[PDB]
């Protein structure tokens, strides 16, 4: 409850698969404390017989002031070598998560679409996924938010 989110803006939208995530994250802090904030971005996939979750990047914002702080979290992109070919061209999900001394207190989930920029390539796919021609689209205008009450003290 001590920290809440005013906003998240996805500056790089739409973007390439390989393109990083720049997340302008407006947030607020009431009653400051020392142990510092762990902002984690987690890729979540769903494919044929698997439900894969892998962490993408993690930033630490320090020190934590009171009021409205706007910081940009630059996050590392996905790795097609570690993702099935279907999740390359399909809808996926990313969980921007912030945690306080081990304790996740807020989790913002976003739909994400991915597909080919080329017109024909979209009508008839290449035999192999060409990540260079994949383009991603974050549905950041409609966050899906989960909040967890952690012992801030």
């Amino acid at each position, epitope marked *: 409850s001590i920290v809440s989110l*005013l906003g*998240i803006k996805v500056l790089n939208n739409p973007a390439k698969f390989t393109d990083p995530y720049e997340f302008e994250i407006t947030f607020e802090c009431l009653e400051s404390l020392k142990h510092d904030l762990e902002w984690k971005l987690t890729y979540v996939g769903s494919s044929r017989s698997l439900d894969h979750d892998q962490e993408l990047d993690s930033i630490l914002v320090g020190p934590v002031p009171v009021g409205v702080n706007k910081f940009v979290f630059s996050a590392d992109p996905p790795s097609a070598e570690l993702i099935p070919a279907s999740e390359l061209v399909s809808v996926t999900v990313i969980l921007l998560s912030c945690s306080y001394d081990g304790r996740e207190f807020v989790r913002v989930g976003y739909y994400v679409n991915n597909e080919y920029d080329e017109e024909e390539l979209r009508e008839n796919p290449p035999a192999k996924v060409q990540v260079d021609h994949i383009v991603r689209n974050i549905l950041a205008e409609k966050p899906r*938010v989960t909040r967890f009450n952690i012992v801030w003290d």
Partner: antibody, heavy 117, light 105 residues
Framework: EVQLVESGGGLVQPGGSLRLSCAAS????????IHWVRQAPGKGLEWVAS????????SYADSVKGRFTISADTSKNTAYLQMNSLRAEDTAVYYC??????????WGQGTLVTVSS | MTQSPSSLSASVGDRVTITCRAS??????VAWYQQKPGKAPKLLIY???SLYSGVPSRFSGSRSGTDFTLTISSLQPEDFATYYC?????????FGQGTKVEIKR
């Protein structure tokens, strides 16, 4: 304890305008996602409207398009399903509910909305 | 989207499975609710397989392709109700037609 209380139910004429109010307690609606779901007598659940947080931004069942406006006033910790051009098919118990990720963890008790001549 | 069976007779201790077929395969988008008459739905399972807090361990979920499934590993008297799958999809939220689980005698 977090509660959710609907209001503004009653009888309304076809083509009439009604406005429900989802009153919140235990939480501020600006951080959360808020939805309206309705249940005709002895029928399944039907979603009509979602308000998402941070940037307003809404989604509406195709049937209630343009006729319905979900919205929220954060000062007054409250949301509003606004129905215009109401038809006899929209008579039902209207639920309002908080988002839990992509689920709905807390619900009102509802109000009955009867539209008929 | 497509919920089967609309109706199920069963006894206490039995093992029940309801099945929902959605267009999307995103496990994050799917939950299940239980509703008794005159009462608001209660969440049971979120994001296909996660036990919502409070809910008993006899409830469980999973995804296989487009099909989602809730099972109750051994019915209880309090478990006789109607069940609904929810797909919180890209554009719009959908609910399955529902499944009413009545007692056999």
């Amino acid at each position: 304890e977090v509660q959710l209380v609907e209001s503004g139910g009653g009888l309304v004429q076809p083509g009439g305008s009604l406005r429900l109010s989802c009153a919140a307690s235990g939480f501020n609606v600006s951080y959360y996602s808020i939805h309206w779901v309705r249940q005709a007598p002895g029928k399944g659940l039907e979603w009509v409207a979602s308000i998402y947080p941070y940037y307003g931004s809404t989604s509406y069942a195709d049937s209630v398009k343009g006729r319905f406006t979900i919205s929220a006033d954060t000062s007054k910790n409250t949301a509003y399903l606004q129905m215009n051009s109401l038809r006899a098919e929209d008579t039902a118990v209207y639920y309002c509910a908080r988002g839990y990720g992509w689920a709905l963890d807390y619900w009102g008790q509802g109000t009955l909305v009867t539209v008929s001549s | 989207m497509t919920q089967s069976p609309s109706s199920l007779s069963a006894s206490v201790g039995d093992r029940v499975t309801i099945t929902c077929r959605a267009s999307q395969s995103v496990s994050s988008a799917v939950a299940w609710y239980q509703q008794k008459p005159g009462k608001a739905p209660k969440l049971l399972i979120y994001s296909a397989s996660s036990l919502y807090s409070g809910v008993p361990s006899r409830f469980s979920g999973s995804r296989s392709g487009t099909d989602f499934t809730l099972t109750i590993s051994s019915l209880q008297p309090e478990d006789f109700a109607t069940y609904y799958c929810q797909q919180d999809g890209w554009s719009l939220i959908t609910f399955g037609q529902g499944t009413k689980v009545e007692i056999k005698r």
